[PDB]
Amino acid sequence: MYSEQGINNTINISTTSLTNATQLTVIGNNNSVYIGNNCKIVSSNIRLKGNNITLFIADDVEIMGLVCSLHSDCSLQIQAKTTMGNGEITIAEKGKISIGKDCMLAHGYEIRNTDMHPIYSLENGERINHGKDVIIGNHVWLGRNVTILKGVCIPNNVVVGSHTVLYKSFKEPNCVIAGSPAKIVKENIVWGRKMYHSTMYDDPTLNEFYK
Template sequence: MHLRKLFRQLLSLPKTVYFNFKVLELKYAIKLPFYIDKDIRFGKLYKDIVKLNFEPKRFSIKFGEQVVDGIPENTKGYVSMSKDSCIEFDGYAEFAYGISFYTKENAYIKIGSDFYCNKNCVIAARKSIKIGNNVLMGWNISIIDSDGGNHLVYENDVLKENKKDIILGNHVWICSCSHIMKGVTIPNDTIVAYNSCVTKSFSDENSIIAGSPAIIVKRNIKWER
């Protein structure tokens, strides 16, 4: 398994080098802080929109890391960072195979340290997504801060806001097949149960939220990685 992983990293080296030198300043790019799997597709990429708020090491941030867990991949992976957007990383982060990660113009994504997400996750920002430290995401999760595209929704003839910030606190565990919708804040030390759809913000820490739409089902809980 170790040799297979090493061989895949060698095959991914051209795409890894291209990405680092495309989006980072030279002083950071030469350290190759990003690992990009050979199967990742690129959308838009621009210089000076990625900020590293830590001293990077080789492959500190991985896109498309292989996972052997029996879960089928929906896609090989896609990364796009539009002009005038901003993406910040505070430390180590790993995005498994099938990741779709993108910003639209003037959008913002911040990823805290010790971040991990499993296969087939979507993180899509049209406005702002902030993720705290030590956040764990299962497979088939979507975090999308808008209604998508240019869709307009009216309530009592009043136009509703299409885009709203998403904030995930520190030490949050989002279980597989869950969806975090626009305008949601999830506090520290929270578990989002399997197959939940979170449509509103919560303030109680150390809780489990579950269901569609999600509600608090347990309090005074703790979890460990």
């Protein structure tokens, strides 16, 4: 499991959550890790290197096979009830990525606020791919092998179709987004976890989205 090299690191992993086969490494200082009850954070590899990094995983989060790299002054926030399969999250350039509550992220997700390397214009020598924060709203379903790139904001209750690559933000909630270039392909929907709930009304979790 754990491996630290530094001082004033705060690691509070709630007592009920499980972290089987997970490696957590914190190199650096004034960092904080927080995992709530009753999380399942399994077969993952999480690296914090730097200072003043924040990793916050709320209650009731299940993650399996996450590779996570966090650099100095970055923060990853994952809200309650979010489930995640295999995937990768990279944060750099002192940015932030937030993932709202009750998300379902299917295997193969790649999420990042950065390209990790600079691209400059020959026209004026300036950098033009500065990193940008990623906001993934509440009740977002990412299908298989979805890629969410820097600065993309995803509204609440959105489904992203399998193998879709997102470069830009969308504003409309309750919609499905797929294709290349990524596009709204269906409007006025709500997804759920259980095919055994036959209408949206039979899923206690959904009441809010049709209010």
